[PDB]
Design a protein around this motif. Structure first.
Motif, mmCIF file in Angstrom:
data_model
loop_
_atom_site.group_PDB
_atom_site.id
_atom_site.type_symbol
_atom_site.label_atom_id
_atom_site.label_comp_id
_atom_site.label_asym_id
_atom_site.label_seq_id
_atom_site.Cartn_x
_atom_site.Cartn_y
_atom_site.Cartn_z
ATOM 1 N N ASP A 268 -5.442 3.018 2.882
ATOM 2 C CA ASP A 268 -6.095 3.922 1.920
ATOM 3 C C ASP A 268 -5.191 5.062 1.413
ATOM 4 O O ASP A 268 -5.642 6.194 1.228
ATOM 5 N N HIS A 269 -3.912 4.731 1.156
ATOM 6 C CA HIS A 269 -2.888 5.664 0.690
ATOM 7 C C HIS A 269 -3.059 6.085 -0.757
ATOM 8 O O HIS A 269 -3.368 5.265 -1.621
ATOM 9 N N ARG A 270 -2.793 7.375 -1.011
ATOM 10 C CA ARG A 270 -2.791 8.002 -2.330
ATOM 11 C C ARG A 270 -1.939 9.273 -2.335
ATOM 12 O O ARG A 270 -2.037 10.096 -1.416
ATOM 13 N N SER B 50 0.797 -1.229 0.000
ATOM 14 C CA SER B 50 0.000 0.000 0.000
ATOM 15 C C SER B 50 0.835 1.287 0.000
ATOM 16 O O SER B 50 0.322 2.341 -0.370
ATOM 17 N N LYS C 168 -6.870 5.624 -5.340
ATOM 18 C CA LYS C 168 -5.875 4.606 -5.000
ATOM 19 C C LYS C 168 -5.413 3.902 -6.279
ATOM 20 O O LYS C 168 -6.244 3.382 -7.026
ATOM 21 N N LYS C 169 -4.096 3.899 -6.537
ATOM 22 C CA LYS C 169 -3.500 3.217 -7.692
ATOM 23 C C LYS C 169 -3.399 1.727 -7.340
ATOM 24 O O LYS C 169 -2.809 1.410 -6.303
#
Ligand SMILES: Cc1cc2nc3c(=O)[nH]c(=O)nc-3n(C[C@H](O)[C@H](O)[C@H](O)COP(=O)(O)O)c2cc1C
Ligand SMILES: Cc1cc2nc3c(=O)[nH]c(=O)nc-3n(C[C@H](O)[C@H](O)[C@H](O)COP(=O)(O)O)c2cc1C
Lengths: 246, 246
Positions: free
Chosen positions: B10-12, A36, B171-172
């Motif tokens: 939930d990283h972006r 992530s 999110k990729k």
């Protein structure tokens, strides 16, 4: 402070572990959190090897400098810089792999592995587990490559000991904020800050060993950085197919 | 499960920011969390430069390849691999600095900087802020050293754009678990997993551009990694007093 901030702020690495095995649910959460995290150009240049077999884990323990905590914990994770996926990607698009002939591929791979390790650390420690990275995997890295069956364009960066703690341990004091955080430009006046930190570190060591050791920060750092402790570093990169731009 | 895992899950990376300045209370928390992270032999080989001045921050943006988000965000952090403290430490104990004459010092510095960038990422993102690491700091590194007044044994690793977001973004998707996580030994059968990943990445890029771009993962990776994109890397390390063991 948030649960995320309190997980990072209260960081203590542990070397004392229990017989208790790390569940698959915990491992999957540690690998999903590491994935992530951010990666250079979304290339995801990090490969994670989970070692749970006592015999293999014992060989890894000895090759890292006979660290008792590696054979003590039930799971030993290994963060490898991976450009083999980039090689498969280049083969799929009839393109050459040029990056591996430059020092940038080394900087990208090592920085990405540090990002993945920290994400794996914050996830594991929030679950109640204890972690300790093992940079010692570069002691005998050619033997590590043979053991883990690492192919061309894959090199071991650092290990990570994941298990259930038996001891709470104590937070190691860090350098003064002014010494690490420099506003706008680099601050060259750091000698006085290092001298004050050495006084705080000598007192920390004294209370930790009950007045047996007086080792300050500058003392224990200079003793190991006195020489090139890991000579097989260039030999490891050159064996996996990495070149440099002189 | 917990707030720390949720922050990472939930990283972006945010590239659209507001005029809203990052407070000193937020900055100190991000710095303290980065310092709280683990470092090889407790040497703390990471130096953090906070750039808030628009004019300096604009020069850094143009050197990183005209990245608009750098000049847009109010703060531009920069994580540097620091062995100047190790040099002061060695001088205080009348000892030589040998590590910098090997590739290990480069691997230690880059891995530790990646750790500190990640500890800052989870802290800043949990506070509500948006981040984007800058690997572009290695485009013109000699000009970066001049700008930040970077001394010997100090080299720029990666920057970090911290600010208040103007959009949530998306999110990729990441590589299949089996492709990144290998149990016991390295798994060489990854071609089929990359091919399936390209199909899921072409669909992601279709939905985010409204059927305008069909770019898969392998195509994006092949193109950049086709060559040594950052040539001044060895020219940067050597200028900063780092040598390689041959
Ligand atoms: C990349 C890296 C490599 C490390 N290698 C070792 C190692 O070989 N053995 C060990 O016992 N600890 C190792 N450590 C742990 C450090 O000694 C430890 O993080 C440091 O003393 C800071 O203390 P703390 O994490 O307990 O707060 C390593 C840490 C990092 C980040
Ligand atoms: C070390 C590093 C360097 C990066 N360099 C750049 C850069 O120069 N410019 C940029 O816009 N993004 C850069 N990124 C961000 C990546 O493009 C991004 O993390 C990746 O696409 C994964 O997407 P996500 O973080 O949004 O989930 C970098 C990320 C890392 C970890």
């Amino acid at each position: 402070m948030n649960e995320a901030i309190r997980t990072i702020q209260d960081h203590r690495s542990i070397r004392q572990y229990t017989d208790e095995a790390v569940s698959d649910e915990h491992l999957d959460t540690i690998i999903q959190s590491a994935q992530s995290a951010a990666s250079s150009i979304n290339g995801q240049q990090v490969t994670i090897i989970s070692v749970q077999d006592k015999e293999k884990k014992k060989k890894l323990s000895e090759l890292a400098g006979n660290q008792a905590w590696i054979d003590q914990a039930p799971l030993f994770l290994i963060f490898c810089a991976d450009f083999n996926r980039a090689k498969i990607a280049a083969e799929l698009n009839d393109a050459p792999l040029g990056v591996t002939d430059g020092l940038e591929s080394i900087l990208v791979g090592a920085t990405d592995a540090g990002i993945s390790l920290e994400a794996a650390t914050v996830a594991a420690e929030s679950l109640g587990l204890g972690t300790v990275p093992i940079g010692g995997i570069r002691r005998k890295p050619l033997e590590v490559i043979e053991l883990l069956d690492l192919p061309e364009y894959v090199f071991p960066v650092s290990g990570l000991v994941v298990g259930h703690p038996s001891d709470h341990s104590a937070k190691k004091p860090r350098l003064p904020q002014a010494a690490v955080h420099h506003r706008e430009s680099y601050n060259h006046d750091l000698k006085s800050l290092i001298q004050d930190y050495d006084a705080e570190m000598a007192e920390y060591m004294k209370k930790r060993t009950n007045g047996a050791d007086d080792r300050n920060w500058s003392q224990t750092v200079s003793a190991i950085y006195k020489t090139i402790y890991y000579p097989e570093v260039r030999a490891m990169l050159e064996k996996q197919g990495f070149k440099f731009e002189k």
